[PDB]
């Protein structure tokens, strides 16, 4: 039971600085180096640097020197990384990890990660539009329908179909960030073309950050 405890998600304005922590427990904090790693979508993992608690020696990847700064509090068994001059390029999940102690290393203990989002956008609930079945048809065997959840911030929104009773054939897509800085997402479900009159199809949308909740009936024509 050696463990790593990271701080909660952060939402920052471009230009601001943020300081995340990592509280190490179950071992003698002072002899081991703490590693920091960056993970943004489409960019695998990147090594930021490491600091040794006590002596405070540190090693920085040249790519992040001016941008990241580490410190470690010996008493509270906590280490920190401050990221400055934030940009969208800095939105990522950041991990801290316990590496090696003087000549030795039998593997790592990774913290659970801290999500950082950098954006100028204000909180905003979404508009839900229907994706109506069959262009100019009704008879085609199986039909598709769904809901377009557009223009919200920040993530996430949840979507269910018919309050949870409709699960099979449901595909809810990853949200996409539009140029406007707002998110959009789609949820679809295919149904037997012979329900489109004997059945109701409502998609339940919820956006907690804005205390938004919408139920949308979707249907032919």
């Amino acid at each position: 039971q050696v463990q790593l405890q990271q701080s909660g998600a952060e939402l920052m304005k471009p230009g601001a600085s943020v300081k995340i922590s990592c509280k190490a427990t179950g071992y003698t904090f002072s002899s081991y180096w703490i590693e920091w790693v960056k993970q943004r979508p489409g960019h695998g993992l990147e090594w930021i640097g490491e600091i040794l608690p006590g002596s405070g020696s540190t090693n920085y990847n040249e790519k992040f020197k001016g941008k990241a700064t580490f410190t470690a509090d010996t008493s509270s068994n906590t280490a920190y990384m401050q990221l400055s001059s934030l940009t969208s390029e800095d939105s990522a999940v950041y991990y801290c990890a316990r590496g090696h102690s003087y000549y030795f290393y039998d593997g790592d203990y990774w913290g659970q990660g801290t999500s950082v989002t950098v954006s100028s956008a204000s909180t905003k609930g979404p508009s839900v539009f229907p994706l109506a079945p069959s262009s100019k048809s009704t008879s085609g065997g199986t039909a598709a329908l769904g809901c377009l959840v557009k223009d919200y911030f920040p993530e996430p929104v949840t979507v269910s179909w018919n309050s949870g009773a409709l699960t099979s054939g449901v595909h809810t897509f990853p949200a996409v960030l539009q140029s406007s800085g707002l998110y959009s997402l789609s949820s679809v479900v295919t149904v037997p073309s012979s329900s489109l009159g004997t059945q109701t199809y409502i998609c339940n949308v919820n956006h907690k950050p804005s205390n938004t909740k919408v139920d949308k009936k979707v249907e032919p024509k």
Binding site: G44, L45, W47, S135, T142, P174
Partner: protein, 211 residues
Amino acid sequence: DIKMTQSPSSMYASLGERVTITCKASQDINSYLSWFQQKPGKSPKTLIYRANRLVDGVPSRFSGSGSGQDYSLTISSLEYEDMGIYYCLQYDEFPYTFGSGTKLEIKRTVAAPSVFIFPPSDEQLKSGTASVVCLLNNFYPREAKVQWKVDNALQSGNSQESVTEQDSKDSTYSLSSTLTLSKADYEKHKVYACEVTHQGLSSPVTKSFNR
């Protein structure tokens, strides 16, 4: 900085197969290489350190080998829980650097997409914007191309797509493409078409609508 070249960038494999992932360093790293496994939304987990030493608790089906500049991670008999992305990391000289990753997915039979097109609702038209959506449902493998044409003019720059991860029941993917237009532009043209290209299709399918 040392460059780590990992291969392949992705691969489909069946349960029971022997999977080998390689990593080549730009210079000799003296076995100071570690391998990690990461699953969607979870933290990486260390599998091997010093090139061939298994982390306590990792199943014995994982092994690493190599020396000098060439290394590899081998999963002797693949299991469903092994799907995810793997990374190598050299810690021989600063700055420590990672490979670009290998995405491991489950292989199944080719299956062509069922395609559907959805015009903007009048409700959205009110606002002043039109989103036209194209859906490609339950296909394999991943690679696919969607091309939007309005009155035969090809659109570029004004569409965005997202895809699901492989399905737990049938290992296929689903994808949506949204074409966004000003209410005005939309009202200016007539024929809106979505052309989909995919292995499963003997020829490029088109779904379109008018107005």
